[PDB]
Amino acid sequence: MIQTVEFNEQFSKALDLMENTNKNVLIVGRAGTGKSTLLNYFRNNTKKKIAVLAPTGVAAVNIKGQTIHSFFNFKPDITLSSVKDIKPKNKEIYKKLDAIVIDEVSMVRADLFDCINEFLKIHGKQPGEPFGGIQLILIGDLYQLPPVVTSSEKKFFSQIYKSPFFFDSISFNEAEFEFVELEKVYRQKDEKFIKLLNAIRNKTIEEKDLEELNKRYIPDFEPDEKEFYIYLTTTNELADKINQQKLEKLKGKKYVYQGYIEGDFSEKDLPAPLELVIKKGTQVMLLNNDYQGRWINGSMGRVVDIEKVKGNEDIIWVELEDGEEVPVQPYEWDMFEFYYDKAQKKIKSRTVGSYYQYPLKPAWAITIHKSQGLTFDKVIIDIGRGTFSHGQLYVALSRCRSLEGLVLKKPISEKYIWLDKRVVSFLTKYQYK
Amino acid sequence: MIQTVEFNEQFSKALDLMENTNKNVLIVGRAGTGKSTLLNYFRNNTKKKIAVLAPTGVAAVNIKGQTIHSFFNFKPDITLSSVKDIKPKNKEIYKKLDAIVIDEVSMVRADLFDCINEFLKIHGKQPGEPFGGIQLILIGDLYQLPPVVTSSEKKFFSQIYKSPFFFDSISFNEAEFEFVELEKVYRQKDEKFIKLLNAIRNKTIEEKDLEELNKRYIPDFEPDEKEFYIYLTTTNELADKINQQKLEKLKGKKYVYQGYIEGDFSEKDLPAPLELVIKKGTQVMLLNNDYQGRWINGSMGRVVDIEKVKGNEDIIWVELEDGEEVPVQPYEWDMFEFYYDKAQKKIKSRTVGSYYQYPLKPAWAITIHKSQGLTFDKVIIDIGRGTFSHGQLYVALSRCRSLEGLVLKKPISEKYIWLDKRVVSFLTKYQYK
Ligand SMILES: Nc1ncnc2c1ncn2[C@@H]1O[C@H](COP(=O)(O)OP(=O)(O)O)[C@@H](O)[C@H]1O
Ligand SMILES: Nc1ncnc2c1ncn2[C@@H]1O[C@H](COP(=O)(O)OP(=O)(O)O)[C@@H](O)[C@H]1O
């Protein structure tokens, strides 16, 4: 229960809208703003009978949340008509809930948002009113690739929703959300990078500074066995090839570790891959924040000599960016579920599942979607390799930390870097309202 | 320099034909016989500058010998025409060789035998017609299945060779081959079963023994969990799926061990599987002979708690058929290659490859072909599934030890056990010559 979080104007304004008011609110930052920090400070220090949810199972386990389809008992094929037949597991709850938070709201499609509103409108405190009158708190990175919509759905989805963004859902317009944008980049020496990114957001590109970009299209391929460059790909398939090809053409023995599921857990979504295949000298990424304060979620390293085990489970030493030769051991992930405790006036969260695996994954290459909400010091913006579609360039650039660590494989650097101005329309509406 | 071999008439007659004479010889056993015993006693205690070969890489590593393709530089697709263009790696050798042994000759197809004869006809010591004069010693079990012949090659193979068995090759006919059959059953004592099996051999079975066979012809199932049983299948696909089905169902944690290849080896013929996926409580097969004298090749067991005490490597504790608790650790297999050294005026064997892996594999089900030369106390004979072969039943029955341990999946059985009388013809020719 600590207080070491630097309460600035935006932070204090957001907490004001959150706790003392019961208004629907939308808080955005871009990577470093304190989205998880603000959410969790509210989460720990409130008595407001709240429920914290997240779109994916990976996002839910990280925030210790409830994996929304599970919280509402939504089948993978849910629709605005089938939602009406859903019987709540925990019917007694959603009458008592005062507020509900949703993290990483960027990747919640419009149809699912409308299903949520209908569900809370029928089972909420005040039925008929938006969300049953329950205060809704949205937290996410607007500067994100919209939720994909398969080719089959495309024809009629285009006719129901203007965009797969959550903010183009009919329920979001009929309800008023106070807008708060986190602008402060904490623990960030990324000076002039965010100014460049904000310049790319607007029409202020200052193409002298655009060609100040044109300086880092080096090719000559290459990297180093030391410089920890990560490839950002558009699809799993390409990231999956770079991980394997780098894993091959590499000597030493491979070590394979199988994740263990206790209780109930889906595969996917797993934070760490189920089969951890590590050779000596393998570039890896750590997928959780260390309690002991040694590495963070996304801290890259290089697998080094494993000492083998004493009578406990074996460890994987890793050579971090700064040093560091840290012993990584398997980490326990838990899958929560919120419920009301009839005994007292409180909503408790029991754990229905456990998952055990080394918190690491091969980190020679990653996909943009997998790297949502992460910044890497040295990145490689690789080939498409089948379509570099509209507005994917601003997101990929927003994955980087500095310009002197950015290497652009293809020197494309042209006039569709622009953030995909559906978002831009939404932001210019709310910032000036 | 061991002398513990109890040199029975058959044995002394076979060694006499081997050592003092230079005649081609054909020794057959029934896998309880002294085949490996005779081969290794001759191998160790001789001064005859010989070369020991085996068809597969697995059979070669077990006998500490070389594969036929490796010794002759035979490409996987060799034909009798292309053999003439093969340049020997070690041309100088095959002038010095006095004898050549070939173990597990049962699984040597006719075309390969003719290629061997042609090669030694061209490069051998005094390279005339009979293998270039090199004395050939063949050792194998005739009671095993013939070497498979793909459907494509079948049409024209059928017209050149009457059967894919080695004795229907050409060379053999114009080859003086003394015949010795090890018929005496080396104990573990085979009392009722070998008499019944030999009765099926000579088609002299009695319907008293058919009815006494029909007694273990029962429907239903299950293995008594401890009680070790195995399902002998016709195909890898069926047997290996049963190993997976028993492995998924059973609870606990998975442990994955990767074999390490040093130098040069093969991925097709490995003694232990390359990826050992082992759960606690899993039936295993202990697939090599322990020097310390704790378990034999084929001695089945059930994995019990794996004590991962390390500062080098962890140990897999296994409960044998009698008892038990043996610590199984990785075993080193080596791939030899013979060469002639004028300095010692003899045939030395250097090791060009090494393979390290725990000598274990899941043993809920294995294929007849994999289990060549083995007897198991408790066997489950399925239907193939389906109608196994013309003559697969006799081999499957010859895999068993006793009738009070053989369990036949289904009573259909009517009479198709009969030995594959191409073998019967050959055996009645040589036994009465
Ligand atoms: N508002 C803030 N006050 C104090 N520290 C912050 C704040 N925002 C970010 N930080 C620092 O930055 C780090 C990452 O913040 P985080 O909450 O993960 O940002 P986001 O959730 O936007 O990714 C935290 O470890 C914290 O130390
Ligand atoms: N000549 C022999 N003298 C004594 N015991 C033998 C002899 N041959 C075989 N045995 C017994 O049979 C076992 C297997 O013999 P082996 O040569 O491996 O048979 P095969 O080659 O037919 O599998 C040996 O462990 C041994 O105890």
Numbering used by the authors:
A (entry chain A), B (entry chain B): 1 to 433
Please give the exact wording used by the authors of the publication that reports this structure.
Pif1 is a DNA helicase belonging to family SF1B of Superfamily 1 (SF1), which unwinds dsDNA with 5′ to 3′ directionality. Pif1 is involved in DNA repair and is necessary for the maintenance of mitochondrial and nuclear genomes integrity, in the regulation of telomerase activity and in the replication fork progression. We were able to crystallize the helicase core of Pif1 from the thermophilic bacteria Deferribacter desulfuricans and Sulfurihydrogenibium sp., which are moderate thermophilic bacteria, living at an average temperature of 65 °C. Pif1 from these bacteria are named DdPif1 and SsPif1, respectively. The helicase core of Pif1 from thermophilic bacteria is very similar to other bacterial Pif1 structures already solved. The HC contains the features of previously described SF1B helicases: two RecA-like domains 1A and 2A containing insertions 1B and 2B, respectively.
An unambiguous solution was found in MR with four molecules in the asymmetric unit. The four molecules are arranged in two dimers related by tNCS. The same feature is observed in the SsPif1-ADP structure where the N-terminal part (residues 1-22) participates in ADP binding.
